[PDB]
């Protein structure tokens, strides 16, 4: 059990939680594993709540401090002075060393950490108009996510992943004979309590 998202400004620090239920909290190791967007799995270090012992990967020896709240049955990882290279996902993991219960590996949901100075900006929704592909360009928003539909629906649609404020595209394609029927792209940015439904016209 871990929170899903944390915002944290550049050069600030974050204290990530991992509540453990359903086993002897002081009998296993809890691990930390870092995944950057679309890249691999790095093991940051771990802690043995029952005895307080720690390990840190050399690549994190001075960035991270693991500590444990025996009372809450919770572990904490604290990273120092966050850069952009630090924006990533942080899984916590129970796994066994040895043999007797070898397949015991169990992962937290993870925590998406974004590092930004930005503020909740609304989004601009621009239409893309010319057997025919249409489109919306959702530009300059923060935070994530937005969610685009076309009523719906539903098929032939490609909602792309946001890129950097944030900005995504979304293509719908439809039979050409259908240019006399209304096609509208429905953006929603939950954090700016904004909802835009832009008719695509020529």
């Amino acid at each position: 059990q871990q929170p899903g998202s944390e915002l944290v400004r550049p050069g600030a620090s974050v204290k990530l939680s991992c509540k453990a239920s359903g086993y002897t909290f002081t009998s296993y190791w809890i691990n930390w594993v870092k995944q950057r967007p679309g890249q691999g799995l790095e093991w940051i270090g771990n802690i043995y709540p029952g005895s307080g012992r720690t390990n840190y990967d050399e690549k994190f020896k001075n960035k991270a401090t693991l500590t444990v709240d025996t009372s809450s049955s919770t572990v904490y990882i604290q990273v120092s002075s966050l850069t952009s290279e630090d924006a990533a996902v942080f899984y916590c993991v129970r796994w066994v060393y040895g043999n007797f219960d070898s397949a015991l590996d169990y992962w937290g949901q993870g925590t998406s950490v974004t590092v930004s100075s930005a503020s909740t900006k609304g989004p601009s929704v621009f239409p893309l108009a010319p057997t025919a592909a249409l489109g919306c360009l959702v530009k300059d928003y923060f935070p994530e996510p937005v969610t685009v539909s076309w009523g719906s629906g539903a098929s032939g649609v490609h909602t792309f992943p946001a890129v950097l404020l944030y900005s995504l595209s979304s293509v719908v394609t439809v039979p050409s004979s259908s240019l006399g029927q209304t096609y509208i792209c429905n953006v929603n940015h939950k954090p700016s309590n904004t909802k835009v439904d832009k008719k695509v016209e020529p």
Binding site: S27, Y28, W29, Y48, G50, S51, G52, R53, N55, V96, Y97, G98, N99
Partner: protein, 259 residues
């Protein structure tokens, strides 16, 4: 890297051996923690992993060499390395299970026995008991070779387990007790080789609870006395830590020193 302490059986003398055991005691504990004149091993709690183990390299006349791993917290053997392979006694818990992954980190082959390293199981896997298994520079010479050749299919389980019993007593228990160190000292001088008498066996079995009784004692006096055995197998109680000062040399950490 962990500290290493060397000992050959080849040409071993009383001094060559005494030095080894005193060197082993030195790297097991700092000797800053002493209760009633008896040193204490480091507290397992809060101990950095890079100070958890020491390494003991045994060599023999046959030009073979193995390295045993001792837990500073217990002074007991947790495993060994021999060439490209390291073998470990089954860990009783997950802290211990993680600790040994810090040992012999550069070996090609690591294995973990299903069995612990306590005397009870090893005696079983050996077919002999401690009082039937001779100790001495001879038996030690043979233990080093058996452990070495286990990697290469050349050593059967009963002989492996038995060789452990030889090592554990001549290293761990000799470090733990000055009495047992002496019993090995005599075996080297008069070139003897013999099983331990009941005075030795009794101490090994009682080391943990001697450690407890001394540390939770009243100004030295035991809450309940502890029964041991003489060489002739006769039983006698110990009531106070004074009789033990020339006998026990290392205790396992049990509690913080009282006022």
């Amino acid at each position: 890297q962990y500290p290493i302490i060397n000992f050959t059986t080849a040409g071993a003398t009383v001094q060559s051996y005494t030095n080894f055991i005193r060197a082993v005691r030195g790297r097991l504990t700092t000797g800053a923690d002493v209760r009633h004149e008896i040193p204490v091993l480091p507290n397992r709690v809060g101990l950095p992993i890079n100070q958890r183990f020491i390494l003991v390299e045994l060599s023999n006349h046959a030009e073979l060499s193995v390295t045993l791993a001792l837990d500073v917290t217990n002074a007991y053997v947790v495993g060994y390395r021999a060439g490209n392979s390291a073998y470990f006694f089954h860990p009783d818990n997950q802290e211990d299970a993680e600790a040994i992954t810090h040992l012999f980190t550069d070996v090609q082959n690591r294995y973990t026995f299903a069995f612990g390293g306590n005397y009870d199981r090893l005696e079983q896997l050996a077919g002999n008991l401690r009082e039937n298994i001779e100790l001495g520079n001879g038996p030690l010479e043979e233990a080093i070779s058996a452990l070495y050749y286990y990697s290469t299919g050349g050593t059967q389980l009963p002989t492996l387990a038995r060789s452990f019993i030889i090592c554990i007593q001549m290293i761990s228990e000799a470090a733990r007790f000055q009495y047992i160190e002496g019993e090995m000292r005599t075996r080297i001088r008069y070139n003897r080789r013999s099983a331990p008498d009941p005075s030795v066996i009794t101490l090994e079995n009682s080391w943990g609870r001697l450690s407890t009784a001394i540390q939770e004692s009243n100004q030295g006096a035991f809450a309940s006395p502890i029964q041991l055995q003489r060489r002739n197998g006769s039983k006698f109680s110990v009531y106070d830590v004074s009789i033990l000062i020339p006998i026990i040399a290392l205790m396992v950490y049990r509690c913080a020193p009282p006022p």
